[PDB]
Amino acid sequence: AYVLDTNVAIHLRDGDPEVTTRVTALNGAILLSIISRVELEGGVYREAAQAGLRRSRLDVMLKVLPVLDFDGAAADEYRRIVESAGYSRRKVVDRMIAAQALAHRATFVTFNADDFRDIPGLSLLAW
Amino acid sequence: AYVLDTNVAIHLRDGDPEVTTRVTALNGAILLSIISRVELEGGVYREAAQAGLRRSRLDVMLKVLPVLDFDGAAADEYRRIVESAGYSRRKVVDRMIAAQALAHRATFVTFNADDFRDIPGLSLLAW
Amino acid sequence: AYVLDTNVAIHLRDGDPEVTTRVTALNGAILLSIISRVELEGGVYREAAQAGLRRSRLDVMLKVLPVLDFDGAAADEYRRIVESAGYSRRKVVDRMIAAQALAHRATFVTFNADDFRDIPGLSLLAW
Amino acid sequence: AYVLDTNVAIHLRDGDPEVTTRVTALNGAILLSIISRVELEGGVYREAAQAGLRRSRLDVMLKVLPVLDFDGAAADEYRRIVESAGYSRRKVVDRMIAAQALAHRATFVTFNADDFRDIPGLSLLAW
Amino acid sequence: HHHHHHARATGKTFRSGNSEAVRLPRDLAFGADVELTLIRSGDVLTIYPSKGSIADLVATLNQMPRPDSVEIRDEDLFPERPGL
Amino acid sequence: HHARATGKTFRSGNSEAVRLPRDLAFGADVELTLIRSGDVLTIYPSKGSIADLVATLNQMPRPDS
Amino acid sequence: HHARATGKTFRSGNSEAVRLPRDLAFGADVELTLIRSGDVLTIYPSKGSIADLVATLNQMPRPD
Amino acid sequence: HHHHARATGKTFRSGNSEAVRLPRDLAFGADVELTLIRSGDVLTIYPSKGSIADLVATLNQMPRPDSVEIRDEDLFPERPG
DNA sequence: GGAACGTATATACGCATATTGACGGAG
DNA sequence: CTCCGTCAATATGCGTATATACGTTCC
């Protein structure tokens, strides 16, 4: 199983050719954190203009990418991350997302692997 | 049922007397957003001389106060919030929290009520 | 089955390479004395830095190693120790752990086996 | 119920009238920690003279008083004592016993109450 | 509930359906629909009402030490992501 | 026999009763003493009384200190 | 629907099966997709292919 | 085995419980303890892993403290009598 | 008479957990 | 013809409801 960073997901809904080919090459379930969904959901209304087209693109992404809820198990993983690596205010959100990947034993796929190499036990895939 | 704001819940964990006097007065269920749990767990270790005392004061809380998992309903409510009020990177964490009070039709307890006046349909208790 | 000396478990908690590498060769059940658990819980908070680790490292150990409760059988074994080797105030903790090893028919794993050569019938492994 | 401090247990075994007269007048359950039983068991052989007399008298005590075994619930309480009060090498043993009183919601009976006033939720009986 | 703080009874267990059970006479009984915590260590079984109320939580909190100050909540937790 | 559980009182015809899970149970032919202090109930297998314990300790010499 | 559990594999008539406790169970008439990657089984209600997502996205307009 | 495999199916009842059937190329094998974790849409199932594996998992993946503690000794006090 | 109440047998449901037999397709 | 995926049934352990009635002892 794979969990896409928010940034990787943003490139997928943007049909970015570089990411989209690497996604279709991946054999295995392709999962999405609900934290990322909340970020995506806000980006739909960032501008007045082409919302609804951003909304139309996000909806087809949700129909195909199953969403992991953020629950007690992931919040246990988050606490364990703060215990080993220390607390980092800037990395709270990304640590919530990785915590879910830990909880479900999934490789975490990201453009920013250096920000996660302090999370013990996280399988990483840098792009 | 009440959902405690994270600041209310930090104050309870850290033993502020004004918060502990008022909390007891509340009827029915008292709940925490899981987003609040994550914030609360990171604070535990921020100041190493108080870690143990905060680890056990927070642990005592989580043995009593149910923690709401962040689910598709809360996410739908989060989308409802941004659609009505507009996107705001700063307000995401508080709106996620509020989105759970909404999803459970709970009343949201906070000192900082002016921060939640743009959230349509929230039941607020201003302390 | 194997019961670990408290020092082995402290070095396991604190990431000692000499003990982490040696423990993996152990076949069968690896067990902890509830007494050893008490000593480990106390250590977690002695240095306030390092407290968040240690807390995290001890927890992971306790999710995997069964801890043996100190009961009437263990107390009977301690009585038999003390009848055969005499009373000794400073050896009471170590003799409580060995008593549980005796009671469960487990081999005691230690790199201070000369402290334990006065316990009868105790199966020892001397590192 | 009541858990007896080891010193109280020692005076009871020794039939100190001021202690045997008070113990009879308690109208709740009288409980002996397996830790106290391990201390008493070693005390049989502290000196050479009257070991059989200390053996004999401890026997008739253990035949009557129910013994709390030291188990996971007690270690849990021990950890919380350490978290709220700080570690103390000197008080570990007394805290394991007090931890058992906490676990069974028993009043702790002691000649040394001032030493246990840093254990939250412990109810004391000072003799 | 209960005229006296202490009360004592003796007896044996009995089977009720598929579990084991102990009868509680009136001067030993908890209430009706009272949620219990049970712990058994060696010889001793202790049974007492569970505490899950905020009064209980707050009472457990107040008997513990307080940290020296109250935490300034960190805000701004969310980063900018390039792209909407 | 070192375990914890939760449960609820129930009515067993005219008398209250409490269920004991397997790991917490005593036998079926053991006599127990049940002592309530406040709302804490303390159960254990019946032994001698405290008074008879002191009576027995009294028929033996006391340690010299 | 947010819980953990432990369990063992078992035989149900010539094929391995795993029980789903009530808190982790899906419906009775719910089509599931099951994907193993190493020893990590991922199960979820069936959704539709990755290509169809990429196909569908590139057949829609991108913004900017 | 292959590293990846995929199937589709629905659930059945196997006693008084739900269950899902694992084909040959998804099955974990007989008498393997499992951890099951569900989070909304997704149920992840994987083998419990509790030998040591402790030493690996995560112990050597986690930072270690500066130094190893020196065990405190002499815990049992002198008591009069 | 009959409350109150301690004692003694039932018959049940929920749900995890066993185990075993038969039909039928695709290697 | 055999794997081995899909039907099945059925049993037991055990916590959890609930009933009925045969007692005492004290109005």
mmCIF file of C-alpha atoms in Angstrom, chain E residues 27-55:
data_model
loop_
_atom_site.group_PDB
_atom_site.id
_atom_site.type_symbol
_atom_site.label_atom_id
_atom_site.label_comp_id
_atom_site.label_asym_id
_atom_site.label_seq_id
_atom_site.Cartn_x
_atom_site.Cartn_y
_atom_site.Cartn_z
ATOM 1 C CA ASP E 27 -25.889 -3.935 53.007
ATOM 2 C CA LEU E 28 -23.150 -4.950 50.523
ATOM 3 C CA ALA E 29 -24.876 -4.036 47.275
ATOM 4 C CA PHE E 30 -24.000 -1.266 44.868
ATOM 5 C CA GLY E 31 -26.953 0.286 43.141
ATOM 6 C CA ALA E 32 -28.928 -0.838 40.105
ATOM 7 C CA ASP E 33 -27.288 -0.333 36.704
ATOM 8 C CA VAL E 34 -23.966 0.598 38.339
ATOM 9 C CA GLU E 35 -20.870 0.115 36.197
ATOM 10 C CA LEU E 36 -18.122 -1.651 38.125
ATOM 11 C CA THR E 37 -14.373 -2.016 37.951
ATOM 12 C CA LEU E 38 -12.973 -5.339 39.172
ATOM 13 C CA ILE E 39 -9.330 -6.136 39.887
ATOM 14 C CA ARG E 40 -7.886 -9.411 41.155
ATOM 15 C CA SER E 41 -4.341 -9.677 42.549
ATOM 16 C CA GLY E 42 -3.466 -12.983 44.184
ATOM 17 C CA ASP E 43 -5.972 -13.716 46.943
ATOM 18 C CA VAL E 44 -7.885 -10.468 46.683
ATOM 19 C CA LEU E 45 -10.728 -9.370 44.406
ATOM 20 C CA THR E 46 -11.608 -5.681 44.685
ATOM 21 C CA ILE E 47 -14.819 -4.322 43.124
ATOM 22 C CA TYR E 48 -15.754 -0.660 43.074
ATOM 23 C CA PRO E 49 -17.775 1.758 40.923
ATOM 24 C CA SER E 50 -16.033 3.048 37.832
ATOM 25 C CA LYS E 51 -15.368 6.730 37.673
ATOM 26 C CA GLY E 52 -15.956 8.261 34.294
ATOM 27 C CA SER E 53 -17.521 11.578 35.067
ATOM 28 C CA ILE E 54 -15.962 14.981 34.746
ATOM 29 C CA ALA E 55 -16.337 15.397 38.479
#
